[PDB]
Amino acid sequence: DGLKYSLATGNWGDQKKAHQARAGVSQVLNRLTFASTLSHLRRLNSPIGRDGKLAKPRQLHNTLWGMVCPAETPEGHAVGLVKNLALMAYISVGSQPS
Amino acid sequence: MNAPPAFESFLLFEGEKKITINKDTKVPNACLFTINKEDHTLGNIIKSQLLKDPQVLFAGYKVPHPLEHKIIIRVQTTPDYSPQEAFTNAITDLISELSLLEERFRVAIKDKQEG
Amino acid sequence: IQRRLIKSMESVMVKYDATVRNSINQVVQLRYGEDGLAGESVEFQNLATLK
Amino acid sequence: MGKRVDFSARTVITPDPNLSIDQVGVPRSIAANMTFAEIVTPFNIDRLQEL
Amino acid sequence: VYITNFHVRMDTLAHVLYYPQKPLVTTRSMEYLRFRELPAGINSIVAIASYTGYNQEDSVIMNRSAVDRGFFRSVFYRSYKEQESKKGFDQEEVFEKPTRETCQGMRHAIYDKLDDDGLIAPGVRVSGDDVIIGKTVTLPENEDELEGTNRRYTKRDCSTFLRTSETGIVDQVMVTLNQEGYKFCKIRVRSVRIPQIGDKFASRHGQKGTCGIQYRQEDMPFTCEGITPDIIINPHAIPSRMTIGHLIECLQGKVSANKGEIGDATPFNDAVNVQKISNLLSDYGYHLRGNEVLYNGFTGRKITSQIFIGPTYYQRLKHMVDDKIHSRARGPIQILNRQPMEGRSRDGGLRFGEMERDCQIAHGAAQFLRERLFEASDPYQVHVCNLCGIMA
Amino acid sequence: QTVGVIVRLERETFQVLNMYGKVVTVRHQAVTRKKDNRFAVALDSEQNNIHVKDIVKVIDGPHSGREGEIRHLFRSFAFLHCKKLVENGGMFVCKTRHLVLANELIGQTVRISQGPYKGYIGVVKDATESTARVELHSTCQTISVDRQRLTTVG
Amino acid sequence: PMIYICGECHTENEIKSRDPIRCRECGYRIMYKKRTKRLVVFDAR
Amino acid sequence: MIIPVRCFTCGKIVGNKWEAYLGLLQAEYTEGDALDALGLKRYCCRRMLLAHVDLIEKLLNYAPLEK
Amino acid sequence: QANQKRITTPYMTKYERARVLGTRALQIAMCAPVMVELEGETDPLLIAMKELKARKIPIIIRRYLPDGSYEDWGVDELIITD
């Protein structure tokens, strides 16, 4: 019931600590078009609060060449804080440095 | 849910007169015809037949709005020629044109087949 | 900012003396705009005596 | 300061150039809900008994 | 078409489109997005011209004879679910067709459409407020009622209704058990949504706009060959927005309707120029810049300026006018504030807010603003003592 | 079948003056609150229209000679109040003729048999004396049709 | 009383209110509602 | 889903030319030669057969509600 | 104040002519006597607008000066802007 809870609601952490806990992980997957799914399954979320008017985290950065799509991004308060992934880009799963 | 019926364009319900004739007070010998449930097919034929009549000073139509189907035809003729006479002679002259065209198209068909 | 400018000025009004006065009757202006003329009917013009 | 109101309607807009400046197209189903209370007189009682 | 198994899936809010088409000018990486398998859109012949003025701003004029043949004609599935349960000791919920005499809370919606088990069979049209699932709850107050003889109403009606102003035919109904083991039922209502003059279309280049009006194939400007644009978009869209790749797609795809090959739009080539396209377009007998001579549809006469036509790939958007429309007159009212409800599904009222009441201090209309914040919304009366000022 | 007016409050019971003029004792929950029809109209003994709030004289029956205010009306009965009457808190009941002023179609599936909509199948949402509202199965819309046009199917 | 269709073996079984939902000859718990008898009439529009 | 009857723009019938058009492709015609054998002159019709996407073959893989 | 010494614009401000044609049309709309000959008018706003151009409306406007005093202008004494 503990996992099934925090995947279901999206408040990510303990339920009583949900105030401290991060929110907005695990949205319901989007069924509009087949290509509204592929860009939901591949997505990147900046934890920064949506409210802030600071424009430095939003701006497109040269290090995003080839690993993040320059054009694709939501608008409204979320501009540039949410980012799709480029086609070839492959996130690394990790290993042991033994 | 508000889409109007498809048949509402060419069908008259109870009480709508096809034609409505209203004199025009701006001008002498000017009349203004109002045709319900018609469109540019019918209005354009007549206007262009009225302008051949040398006793017709002005003729024109307009669809006031495309979503409601009616035509409004102003006609102004010279004195001692009534704008209702102008608009009837127009309609009988098309009928005498189109009856000549349907007969000439039937002759060209028989000529065309095996000839 | 649009909300702050309104709440501060909201009640200023041209009284029948034509003196502009806020909600307390305190005088903001002796005549509106100092010429006492509504702003929608004015136009641009050259003086032509000047310069 | 502001509150939800009755006798209001909201829908998309699309151009009709055939209108005047001050007219507006109002669809029939948005115009069927919204009502205007009208006081009966000897003048309009003929029209309102039909409505 | 979102997934190919959609006939099996039960999802709330599933749009689908009768006739998708893979584009005629297609990026070479769409093959790996599987966009030939599940295309969302239809090609359309697109004039760019100012025609009757109804396509001004971002609007679009459409061909109504096209829309009668299945063009952008889609299906909207909506899915409901209701869960029988056992809550109180004596309190049970059951799926059953309610009777006016035994059941208590009832509405005048037709209950004759429910079967013996209280579920609409599929293939039965239902409009807003028709009763999809009859569900009665046994009223435990009968136990709370002491010596009340046999109470006329033992059962309260919890039945679920179609969302208001949602019309449709019940497509599929299914009856299963949930986690707990209670009976559980999902119901899929669908309705076919024909593109109206409110709906919202957009190309691939960022040109979005509603439908301005629908002219029949008669009234549309036609080429010398009798081709009439399915869709006409305003030319003023282009200059300040500067989507030129919209102008080359109409160009690249007119060579790819003629040659029979599906053009290559992939972003960086140097092998495709506007100049190397046009030389291919001049060989099929067209003006190489794509302009084409049109005749007015109403009056028959040519249009002086040559008009730019080509096949272009448009998308129909989840946003339709039937779901955005709302009207409010003296409906439900909030419990605490005694003000109108919030939201479109609730028959709720629109908000008259701050910025608006500051515009009508500007107009100097005091009696529209007192009526808008008092009479139209909750009016109310209090009795106030004169000595103290408090209520009495 | 029986209505009454509460004329005394007790801890567990009411005393109720029933429509026949008898006072009965009932437990608070043994009676249901009835929606009063403040716009009821009836005829008095001289065929005048009488209404709630009217002052009437009683000219026949047990209370002949009394005067009262109409408080409630139901079928052939009137509950009246007179403050001079100490019995039953002033309430009493008189026949109105003893006083003087001082749908089946809905739900059916019908086929439109005439007019521009001829042939469409639908189901009646509302029936009227004149024009029923048919709910079209073919498209999404509801239309008003004269009831001479409709034809019920099965 | 009520005929339902199994979602696995596709065999119509007759099962009635206040019964657990299991199709005979499978054991599969998902039943479908068949289709209504009454007249549906469409425009070809 | 399935090929439209009645090409959208002009209104000619492309409904019956699909199963004849798959035949020509398996005979090693090029889509330019295929669409000319089928006799579709205008590019309003040539984009119905050329840009079509046939999902009725995918949807027939799933098994029906009733055996 | 006295009929002498009134200090206010003689013209009718567009706020006064908006509430005069409203208040007058509400009276006409309830059985109220009409000062002017009405010809083919079933609409009260058109009647009240007609009474105004003829200066027949029976209303006196009480203008509060900002210092607490007031002046009483009849709708005939004022000069109609439009």
Place this chain on the structure above:
Amino acid sequence: PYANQPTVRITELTDENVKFIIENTDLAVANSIRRVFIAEVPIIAIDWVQIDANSSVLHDEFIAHRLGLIPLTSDDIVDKLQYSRDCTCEEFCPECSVEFTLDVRCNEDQTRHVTSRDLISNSPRVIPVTSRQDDILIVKLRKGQELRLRAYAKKGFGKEHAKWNPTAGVAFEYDPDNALRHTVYPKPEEWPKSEYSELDEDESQAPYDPNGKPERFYYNVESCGSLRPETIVLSALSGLKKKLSDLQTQLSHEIQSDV
């Protein structure tokens, strides 16, 4: 002050196609002819559809959609049928409509194509057009699926719904080499020449003709297969002259009534 007398020359005549050339006519009369080739030529096309059992992967009104658009052979009895609204009888008779029947079930393991050849009509005259060239495909069936329905076809014309258009694209062209200057080319040399052009390859445009007005209106009228293309035209003229003979009537009743 009187009607001009036009003339007709039929150039190509086939079973799909008619090219004729109308001369000595107004631009407005020549248009309103082709504008009647779409709308007002009556035709027979399915309208009322009743679906008994549909197990196909296509939902009910998606098949009822494709059936409408199927062309039906209208060659003759369109003259005989009456519009269903004017027809006096209750529901549908032999006089206002035609009955079709489709009973199709897939027994075999192979995928069955329901084709318009499976529409079965009560009358030999009107059938699907392909039955008079592969057959229109209504839907495909996996084994076990069954589609049976009953459909009454009516008389109507192309203003109502586009499924009554008797015609495919109706071409129209006049003044192919540009004398009248109704369209003004910025560069005259870049434009291809019309099939009907009278000009040598050397010069781009005809020289400006000040007095002229458009004549020689070139048509190409291509049928959908319902009506043979020769009788799409005869039905348009006879159907425009009947709307103009409905005016002269109801105008005459008003001039006589008003006066």
Place this chain on the structure above:
Amino acid sequence: VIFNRQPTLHKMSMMGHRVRILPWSTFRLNLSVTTPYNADFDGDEMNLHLPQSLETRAEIQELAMVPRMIVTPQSNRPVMGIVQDTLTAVRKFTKRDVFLERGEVMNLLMFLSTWDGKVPQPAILKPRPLWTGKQIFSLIIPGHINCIRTHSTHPDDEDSGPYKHISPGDTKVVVENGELIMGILCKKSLGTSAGSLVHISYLEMGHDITRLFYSNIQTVINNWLLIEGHTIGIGDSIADSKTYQDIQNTIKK
């Protein structure tokens, strides 16, 4: 009705309107009206508030009607002006080149609502009668309204030298006695700016005569544009093969 769009930035974003009931599902409003509300038609929505009494309905009618709010107190300019195709068509309609035959005048005059009934005498009487766009547009201009503006392309060397009033390029606009004598109209004359041909109407004539002024320009120049049409095409985004060399040799430089 009163008619709104959020956010309401100034007071032109709530203006009273006059209902006309039309089919389908969307509110419909003139295109000049899309300037104040700052609303383009792509999925927009606008509220509608129907005033409920004759006493509050006579406030809207004499205060907030759209013909009253034409001129803004903010910048003392008109709010609403000719917008989109019509402002492109006006210019193309007003050049010296435009000559309307007798058949195309009969249609345009039919859309003038203020037209006084008299067909004006053609500018070119013989060999064939031809009206001019400046000659028909001068029936639109209401009353006797008078203006001098200048066209956007107006060269600065022109006012100084010879040909001040002959104006070789037809840039300088003159309107004398409600008749358009010379010049091409544009944003600087029909548009919204201080002193535009629209702003002189509301000031000199009145709010009523200037309501029929917008509705005439839009109806008679939208139903004219069906003859000329307008477009953007790739041929219009392309330069000479000689210009492509001058654009590079500047970049390499």
Place this chain on the structure above:
Amino acid sequence: FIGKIPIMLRSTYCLLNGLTDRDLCELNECPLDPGGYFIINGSEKVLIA
């Protein structure tokens, strides 16, 4: 037995791993369906990086 872990679809531990096209249809799954989401209480959840 300590508990139950929600399983991403078409991972190595789903029942759909390694199945071909024909088998994904008998199980009524779309072969084009990318996978990589969870089924929690029937809804389809996507962990967002």
Place this chain on the structure above:
Amino acid sequence: AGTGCFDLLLDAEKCKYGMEIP
């Protein structure tokens, strides 16, 4: 505000004139 700044009074002397049908 505007429309609320002043107060309307009914003139009793003027109502006595004019031809009044209703």
Place this chain on the structure above:
RNA sequence: GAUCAAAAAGACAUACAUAAAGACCAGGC
């Protein structure tokens, strides 16, 4: 001995009050 009544159009008997709040999430202009 005299006398010997049938249940009066039901109007959600009306507010359709299912419209938990509360929250996060997604999108629109």
